[PDB]
Write a protein that binds this ligand. Structure first.
Ligand SMILES: O=c1[nH]cnc2c1ncn2[C@@H]1O[C@@H](COP(=O)(O)O)[C@@H](O)[C@H]1O
Ligand SMILES: O=c1[nH]cnc2c1ncn2[C@@H]1O[C@@H](COP(=O)(O)O)[C@@H](O)[C@H]1O
Ligand SMILES: OC[C@H]1O[C@@H](c2nc(-c3ccc(O)cc3)n[nH]2)[C@H](O)[C@@H](O)[C@@H]1O
Ligand SMILES: OC[C@H]1O[C@@H](c2nc(-c3ccc(O)cc3)n[nH]2)[C@H](O)[C@@H](O)[C@@H]1O
Ligand SMILES: *Cc1c(COP(=O)(O)O)cnc(C)c1O
Ligand SMILES: *Cc1c(COP(=O)(O)O)cnc(C)c1O
Lengths: 810, 810
């Protein structure tokens, strides 16, 4: 059908059909007469999986023979989404599978919709890990992702009476055809116990044992025949565990709970014992696997030449003391040699500066759960502080600030400080964020060891986020500049020579229009809701958080509503305002924001004077598969965090690649996006980081904005008096009180500039030709935001390995 | 190699090899260079499974089209053992698979040993269910086994310091290639709640819901291309279950515990709420499935013409009130019509008369868990007792005895009485047991409804228990009389014409000798123990229970030891005495018996004066796969329960088929075995049922036997004084005290006759020719004990269906 989806050769189509029928009969044990669409999805998934297998075996064989440096990417989260289509794209099988299924009387698009998301992350951090795995495979790196196979991923969100309800995401109910259990490589993980000191060093004894069973998932590179591995650990009780009899067997659940559920917090630290168990579980199993692989090739001097460990935030930070434990207690290396090896092996990526997101574990938890690790942490701290004292003699306050051990009512370990001490490289995830790290929270560490600190601006994979989700746009691009851009996204710059080409302008606008119609129909079918597809699609999708300022968007929506009601017979550019995202279950204010958004919709969408000039839709259950649908349909991307708070963002980049314009603050990667595209092709507004700092020094007083801006006062009076909640007039008083008296994110301070900037958006949308030309300028300069670029930088500047675009033999 | 294992044609061998390599590569994702023997086992299992699939689909299709009467066999236990070899035997693939694997450089016997037993039962009751499934498929019946897929089956037994230790049987750890999950046919099961009475009948409301997910396992018939289904239910929480957030997800375990573990009691009732949940779970899910299948063909008058439900003891007895609940509350049938349908549909098999084994559930448990069922039970009882009062007017004591509701400190429901009331047929499992039912515990019911009471003597499948475990014996039989006996075991009578044939005598003895050498080598390899394979192999394997009288065997072993020590230079026939079996974890006396057996071994096996004339071995972890090894090697089968206590026995029959002679009491099926073979060809001893009754009327006084039999007094003094436990002289005082003062099973009363009978065994063993002739007479008359005979009787006399030996097309 379309070129970028590959060839549908007669031999290949015939073979796919044979194998589909083979799997339906033998694997699924169904005949066509009772097969459901789910059976057909599974038969197709098994058919496509068979094509991965040979490449997977050959790739892993190739690494055993060549013995390259291995990259281990450790994360508590891998937000993978669906696998079927991505696998077909990466193996060039999409058109052949389409044809094969078409000839069997089936619609492949319908079958794709049956697959569950692998929702093993919360948002951006977990999705970054997934994009990175795709880029590492595409760049031929001998890379392994290591994590936890949660039985329950991020909860499914239902909206009932305008409120978020949570349901368990039982993603494994029907089976997962992509994984392979490897019960043969099961490893023990120790907890509790105590330390005894012999003449032959320390011994960690009387421990409870939980088994870590690995499940392997293939990670195909883009058309290079490389298939890497994502290894996820599941918790199993040993068979003598607790061994009246019946109760002992039922109590195996206590051990197996470690891998049961993903903690559903985004940018928030919850210091619970179960979470600490999860962190150690992943680290201890992974490190044993790493060392096993290293020994199958005494001399740990070469360990950093053969192994890189990348810590995805501090969540796997126990890798540092665990590596020391193994090297010192088990392999009998002297402390200094072990520390040298550890530092050269480990690197740390920071993803946030919000204080409530930083992991600070109570000493009493570590003392009970991991007594040997606590001793090792204390020794690291004493040796580290001795270096600080030698470099900055007499600076006693610096010793207190830099300590791994925080004093207070409860003594805590600062895991970020541990990661900096024990890593040869520390990076932020966008230029402004990496600068903030050096100037504020890690300033002291930067002064001691400036060479450690780097930037690696985030990216997204153009396979999933262009080719897979927006084939129409991929194709019209490919017609002009060929297919090479899919693995070399900088080639999109060539599109700048088509900015005045009438046919290209028309095609870009046509693809957007098609995507909007398709999404408007999706909404009607699955959610009984009717939207005008000629309206500007104004989209804010991301987790619900005060710092992301969904509330600022709400204030603009109410402003538009009030302006319409004031002058109903004036023309306004029609908008469909779509907001979606999950709130963490314990985050009360985030749950109230969801309720406000639905309550605004309840008023706006049923006011006959508004008509179809303004609609407000809350998009339920925002997740990777919904992102793939809504992002290609968007006109305007809302990226409106308070300057200094969004470390990078990656949704921002997805929208840029897919032909939306951006309204945003100079925060995270928005700064670099604006720089690449030109500030004239971006809708920038609001306080810069420096302006936020100036306000904080003077003191933020929200009342000043309320007193000076009549349109804002009207909105607050509407919220307070029960206009958006007639039956419960005080329902939103917590929101009003926060905005007026303890708003950490200065919503009112950016309100006037935001509304004015939104008026400029509407003015440009009225001139479709100029809107579309600006879009071309954004798509054309989005190349920097490929995760292939990001990963090549990690590879060269941190891991010390050279990427490769060369194909393994088929 | 041997004829009964089928053809190894070049085409078939080539195809099996191709498919083996296909599964190793694609299914297991291994290459030969890292494959372990476990990988090879799985590749073979998947290869053999592929041959079942077409037949399974066609069989189930055939039943949908023909719509025969369906037989539903409901059991809490299915003791299946291993599947690989049985599948090969039933599909005539054994020699081809042997050849295929041989050409790949692998030993198929070694691969078979890797498979885990499916240990989803305790002993005889669960194993009977498994034999029955094999016979139902072999006889072409449209039969379904329904049960629970326990995550943990019967515990693995380890012996430490002579004591039983229990370990969880994590049988699913490496996967089960035989099952197919069917998450699409998941059904809800209700618990707790309350009953409200509308004008439109009763409604069971406010219930907790647990989901029942089915897993299907194929059950191949013997060379007839029939493949029936065993459907096992697994418990799943619904996704809104308990829905802070983390705890709600972890608490899903409370619902899922229902299918977690098999209760490990044999012939003992433990009235725990979890067990009641298991019983209702299996019944409620199964009955919905039955009704669904019936409707896919208003008129419940035809229900008993299309459906038979066989209750395997009272464990699934809630089927009776559940069927009434569905018919009356949901389908709106009048009570009398529903009861007619229920009675005509259900039949009940009793497997024990021991009072501590009978299920008597406290009313307070049923009231809380199953309030509607309790109401229905009360209504059944009132209507039933009205019939009793009309038939036997004024007999008030009979009303009390026959009531379903037992009065007392705690009110209980007698589930056996419920089953009799609600079934059209009630059977025992051997002639003497069925007579005991009519004369003693069910006498009142027999007088009311004599037509209900039947006998169906138990049997064993000759596929598993001859062809599979003893190919050498199967072959030498087949050389004389052909292969037809494998599905028509009565043809073994033809062997009586070879009782004086010198070559047949030699071959029978040769096969036994080979089996003994093979078992003696197995013992050495796996358990570091050295036995004389020229000794008489004296074997007692079965669950440890006071009624089975392992203690009587112990008394004989000590008697032999003491006789040797008294006259060391006299010849005695050498014996290896082997005792094995599991004790229920809470059954203290059974655990003490195990310790006594090992303690006797500790003395006897290390006494240099004994030499290799007497060895006592405790066979660890007795289970189906160990039975398949030890039974073909046995010379003497110990079946020595107190008369009136072993309802049938089935181990007894396994030994008879495999060329052991039997020493036993006139109990259970031993009576019928002796009748078939001739009493002259059986070593019968001890009290008959009538003699036990006479002793009970006079009063059993164990002291009388102690005072009169010096050899017995010596043994008791050795036990009491610490001869078998020097470091803990009082270790066995509980055993001595029980034997002397509260022995319900009259061990001392059969001691003298048992020892004298054992002397006759030894005398015959000295004349190998006459021993072997007696063996031929036993094997030749074992035909009655085929489960094919048993199932044909159930089919004709209870279910109203005709068996068939006709083949479905291949
Ligand atoms: O002893 C060996 N001989 C040959 N290949 C090996 C051996 N050990 C590991 N491998 C290769 O590496 C394995 C990949 O798994 P890993 O050992 O977890 O990296 C297999 O797929 C083999 O291809
Ligand atoms: O609607 C139908 N059309 C054709 N065959 C059916 C239908 N429903 C059930 N079957 C057959 O019976 C099924 C066996 O599963 P069951 O329905 O659980 O007995 C399938 O394997 C089909 O062969
Ligand atoms: O760099 C990729 C993403 O990491 C996100 C981010 N997520 C988290 C986090 C997640 C879970 C948790 O328990 C604790 C913190 N920190 N930072 C950033 O907010 C986003 O700006 C960035 O693009
Ligand atoms: O008829 C086959 C077998 O059932 C055995 C038997 N097992 C049980 C039982 C099992 C588990 C349980 O929880 C409660 C009772 N009752 N009867 C008999 O003892 C045996 O003689 C018979 O051959
Ligand atoms: C990309 C993505 C995110 C991150 O979006 P931000 O706007 O950068 O917070 C979150 N959730 C999902 C499902 C995503 O695909
Ligand atoms: C046959 C069998 C039984 C029943 O044996 P009995 O001697 O009749 O109690 C118990 N366990 C296993 C493993 C069996 O194969």
């Amino acid at each position: 059908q379309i070129s970028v989806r590959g060839l549908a050769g007669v031999e290949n189509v015939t073979e796919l059909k044979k194998n589909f029928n083979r799997h339906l009969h033998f694997t699924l044990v169904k005949d066509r007469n009772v097969a459901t669409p789910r059976d057909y999805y599974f038969a197709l998934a098994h058919t496509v999986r068979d094509h991965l297998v040979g490449r997977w075996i050959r790739t892993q064989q190739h690494y055993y023979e060549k013995d390259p440096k291995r990259i281990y990417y450790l994360s508590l989260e891998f937000y993978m989404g669906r696998t079927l289509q991505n696998t077909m794209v990466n193996l060039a099988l999409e058109n052949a599978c389409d044809e094969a299924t078409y000839q069997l009387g089936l619609d492949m698009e319908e079958l794709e919709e049956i697959e569950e998301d692998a929702g093993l992350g919360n948002g951006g951090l977990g999705r970054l890990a997934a994009c990175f795995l795709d880029s590492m495979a595409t760049l031929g790196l001998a890379a392994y992702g290591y994590g936890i196979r949660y039985e329950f991923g991020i909860f499914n969100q239902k909206i009932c009476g305008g409120w978020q309800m949570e349901e368990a995401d039982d993603w494994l109910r029907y089976g997962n055809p992509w994984e392979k259990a490897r019960p043969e490589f099961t490893l023990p993980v120790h907890f509790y116990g105590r330390v005894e000191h012999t003449s032959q060093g320390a011994k960690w004894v009387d421990t409870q044992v939980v088994l870590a069973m690995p499940y392997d998932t293939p990670v195909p590179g883009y058309r290079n025949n490389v298939v890497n591995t994502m290894r996820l650990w599941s918790a199993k009780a040993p068979n003598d565990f607790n061994l009246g009899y019946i109760q002992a067997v039922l109590d195996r659940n206590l051990a197996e709970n470690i891998s049961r559920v993903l903690y559903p917090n985004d940018n928030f630290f919850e210091g619970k014992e179960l979470r600490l168990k999860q962190e150690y579980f992943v680290v201890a199993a992974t490190l044993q696997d790493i060392i096993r692989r290293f020994k199958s090739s005494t001399n740990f001097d070469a360990f950093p030449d053969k192994v890189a460990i990348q810590l995805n935030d501090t969540h796997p930070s126990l890798a540092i003391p665990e590596l020391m434990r193994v090297l010192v207690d088990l392999e009998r290396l002297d402390w200094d040699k072990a520390w040298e090896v550890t530092v050269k092996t480990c690197a740390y990526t920071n993803h946030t500066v919000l204080p409530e997101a930083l992991e600070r574990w109570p000493v009493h938890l570590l003392e009970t759960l991991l007594p040997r690790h606590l001793q090792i942490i204390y020794e690291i701290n004493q040796r580290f502080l001795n270096r600080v004292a030698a470099a900055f003699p007499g600076d006693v306050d610096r010793l207190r600030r830099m300590s791994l051990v925080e004093e207070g009512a409860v003594k805590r370990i600062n895991m970020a400080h541990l990661c900096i001490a024990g890593s040869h490289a520390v990076n932020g995830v966008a230029r402004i964020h990496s600068e903030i790290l050096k100037k504020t929270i890690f300033k002291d560490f930067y002064e001691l060891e400036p060479h450690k600190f780097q930037n690696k601006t985030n990216g997204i994979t153009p396979r999933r986020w262009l080719v897979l989700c927006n084939p129409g746009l991929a194709e019209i691009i490919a017609e002009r500049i060929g297919e090479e851009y899919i693995s070399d996204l900088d080639q999109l710059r060539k599109l700048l020579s088509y900015v005045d080409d009438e046919a290209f302008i028309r095609d870009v606008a046509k693809v957007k229009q098609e995507n909007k119609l398709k999404f408007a129909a999706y909404l009607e079918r699955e959610y009984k809701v009717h939207i005008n597809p000629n309206s500007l699609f104004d989209v804010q999708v991301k987790r619900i958080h005060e710092y992301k300022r969904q509330l600022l968007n709400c204030l603009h929506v109410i402003t538009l509503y009030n302006r319409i009601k004031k002058e109903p017979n004036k023309f306004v550019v029609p908008r469909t305002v779509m907001i979606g995202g999950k709130a963490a279950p314990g985050y009360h204010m985030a749950k109230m924001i969801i309720k406000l958004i639905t309550a605004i919709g309840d008023v706006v969408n049923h006011d006959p004077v508004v008509g179809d000039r303004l609609r407000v839709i809350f998009l339920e259950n925002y997740r990777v598969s919904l992102a793939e649908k809504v992002i290609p349909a968007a006109d305007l991307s809302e990226q409106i965090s308070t300057a200094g708070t969004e470390a990078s963002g990656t949704g921002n980049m997805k929208f840029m690649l897919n032909g939306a314009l951006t309204i945003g603050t100079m925060d995270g990667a928005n700064v670099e996006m604006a720089e690449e595209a030109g500030e004239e092709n971006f809708f920038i507004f609001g306080m810069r980081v420096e302006d936020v700092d100036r306000l904080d020094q003077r003191g933020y007083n929200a009342q000043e904005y309320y007193d000076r801006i009549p349109e804002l006062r009207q909105i607050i009076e509407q919220l307070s008096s029960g206009f958006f909640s007639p039956k419960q007039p005080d329902l939103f008083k917590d929101i009003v009180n926060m905005l007026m008296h303890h708003d950490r994110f200065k919503v009112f301070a950016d309100y006037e500039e935001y509304v004015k900037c939104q008026e400029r958006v509407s003015a440009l949308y009225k001139n479709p030709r100029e809107w579309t030309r600006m879009v071309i300028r954004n798509i054309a300069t989005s190349g920097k935001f490929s995760s292939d670029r990001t990963i090549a930088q990690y590879a060269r500047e941190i891991w010390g390995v050279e990427p490769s675009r060369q194909r393994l033999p088929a």
